[PDB]
Amino acid sequence: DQCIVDDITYNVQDTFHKKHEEGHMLNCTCFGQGRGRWKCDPVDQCQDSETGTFYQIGDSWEKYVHGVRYQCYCYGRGIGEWHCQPLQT
């Protein structure tokens, strides 16, 4: 048995990643089990409040808020924890 997801074929016991339509990342598993069954879980990741954009652990991004430019970073730590800092030289 196999799994078919987005025109991709996986073997039973295969694991892979997949981007949800909403934009967040998933970790997935192919079970097959007669019907090519597969499941995907929301990965530990960060979601920007303003932009609603998703960032992965280790990712860094910038944003302008009230004319101030920040560098942001996704720590995750099991709670999609992320922090930002004002640009400095």
Partner: peptide
């Protein structure tokens, strides 16, 4: 919580 996904032939 964020949604996951599941699938299988005949879905």
């Amino acid at each position: 919580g964020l949604p996951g996904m599941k699938g299988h032939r005949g879905f």
